[PDB]
């Protein structure tokens, strides 16, 4: 959150200033490069042609889209042309469905028989990442931190203080990020070891 690098730190269902005093059941850091303009399609509910074949999102997503410009890294002095779009597919992907594929798309009446041409399109094409690439069409790095916040016991926790336990007085507790106010008492209740 404090970083001088990030060009976007957009977050959904969590604030980035509250994020460091919270805990998550897991976190998945979904990482890739795009042309910088395409950040508009890296957002929940946006009707993205790149999104539907490369990196989809839930319309009801919880996470942060942490992106930075990396022209000064990835665009080699001899020109970079390493990374690929995906331009076509039969249909839209599900909310985080990756789908590695080798298949020609047909956009009309022509038969393609697993070999390309006019009307017979392969899914991928070069990102032109010249070191002289102006502003918007540059290599932009992205990590989409997806945050899961399930009722399951948490595993990825903020760097919080760990207070001493007190029993039989009123306190404003926070256990694994689950938080409220009450009288806490040790109790007889036979929790099974997995509960």
């Amino acid at each position: 959150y404090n970083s001088a690098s990030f060009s976007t730190f957009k977050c959904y269902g969590v604030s980035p200033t509250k994020l460091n005093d919270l805990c998550f059941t897991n976190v998945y850091a979904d990482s890739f490069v795009i042309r910088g303009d395409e950040v508009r399609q890296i957002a929940p509910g946006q009707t993205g042609k790149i999104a539907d074949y490369n990196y989809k999102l839930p319309d009801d997503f919880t996470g942060c889209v942490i992106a930075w410009n990396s022209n000064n890294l990835d665009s080699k002095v001899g020109g970079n042309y390493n990374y690929l779009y995906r331009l076509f597919r039969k249909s839209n992907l599900k909310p985080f469905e990756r789908d590695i594929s080798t298949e020609i798309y047909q956009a009309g009446s022509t038969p393609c028989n697993g070999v390309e041409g006019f009307n017979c399109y392969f899914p991928l094409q070069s990102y032109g990442f010249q070191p002289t690439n102006g502003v918007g069409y540059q290599p932009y790095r992205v990590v989409v931190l997806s945050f899961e916040l399930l009722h399951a016991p948490a595993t990825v926790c903020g760097p919080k203080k760990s207070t001493n336990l007190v029993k039989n007085k009123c306190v404003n507790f926070n256990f694994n990020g689950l938080t409220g106010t009450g009288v806490l008492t040790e109790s007889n209740k036979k929790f099974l070891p997995f509960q």
Partner: antibody, heavy 125, light 112 residues
Framework: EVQLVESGGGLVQPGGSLRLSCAAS????????MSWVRQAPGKGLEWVAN????????YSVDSVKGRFTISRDNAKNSLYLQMNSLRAEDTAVYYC??????????????????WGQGTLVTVSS | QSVLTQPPSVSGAPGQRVTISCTGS?????????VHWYQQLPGTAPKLLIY???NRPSGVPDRFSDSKSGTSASLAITRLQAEDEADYYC???????????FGGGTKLTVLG
């Protein structure tokens, strides 16, 4: 059929310079943009280059980097080769026959569309 | 630098059988990219023998079958006849290079 025909062969001194070309006869080149290829004499074909619609082209460091160049013109359905500092083993038949890059396209197994009849760089004193 | 090294000759009489090799490295034949071959006597066109690695190109007969794994391809001839006594080459992609990789050259042979 993509009937590819090579053209514009030449003979010049060692360390000289040339321009050469090949054309997809009567068939538009924008669907089938082939890279240059050649025999190494007495041996196999040698990797000269790849190509893409967008540019993004690469050449072999083994013999053709810093010497060969690649371009096309769809008003003329022709590839071209602007070339500097001739070397003796350049002397062979050149065909212009497959299009898809180092990055995979077409399929993870290619098919090769048309090898023509050969144009020539030739080198001697 | 890298080459798909090929056997200089293998042999069968008229109507008989052969199966061959075209052998590179894990950086090419093992690196997911498949392999192709060309028949070419000097000044004949390079005649492509394989399509998709599941088919033969337009009009290329059943004797020109191929099989690929590990670090080698293995093209074939059944029903050898005299014009098959000729030069052939192979091709794929190599991740140790920028681009394409080529084979050592093969001569199929009718028997002595």
């Amino acid at each position: 059929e993509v009937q590819l025909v090579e053209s514009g062969g030449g003979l010049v001194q060692p360390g000289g310079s040339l321009r050469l070309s090949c054309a997809a006869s009567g068939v538009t080149f924008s669907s089938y943009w082939m890279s240059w290829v050649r025999q190494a004499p007495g041996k196999g074909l040698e990797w000269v280059a790849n190509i893409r619609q967008d540019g993004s082209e690469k050449y072999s460091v083994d013999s053709v980097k810093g010497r060969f160049t690649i371009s096309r013109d769809n008003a003329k359905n022709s590839l071209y080769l602007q070339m500097n500092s001739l070397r003796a083993e350049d002397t062979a038949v050149y065909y212009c026959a497959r299009a898809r890059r180092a990055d995979n396209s077409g399929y993870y197994g290619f098919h090769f569309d048309c090898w023509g009849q050969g144009t020539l760089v030739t080198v001697s004193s | 630098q890298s080459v798909l090294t090929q056997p200089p000759s293998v042999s069968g009489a008229p109507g008989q059988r052969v199966t061959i090799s075209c052998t590179g490295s894990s950086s090419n034949i093992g690196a997911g990219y498949d392999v192709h071959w060309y028949q070419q006597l000097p000044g004949t066109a390079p005649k492509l023998l394989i399509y998709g690695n599941n088919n033969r190109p337009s009009g290329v007969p059943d004797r020109f079958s191929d099989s690929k794994s590990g670090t080698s391809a293995s093209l074939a001839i059944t029903r050898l006849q005299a014009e098959d006594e000729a030069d052939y080459y192979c091709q794929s992609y190599d991740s140790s290079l920028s681009g394409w990789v080529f084979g050592g050259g093969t001569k199929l042979t009718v028997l002595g």
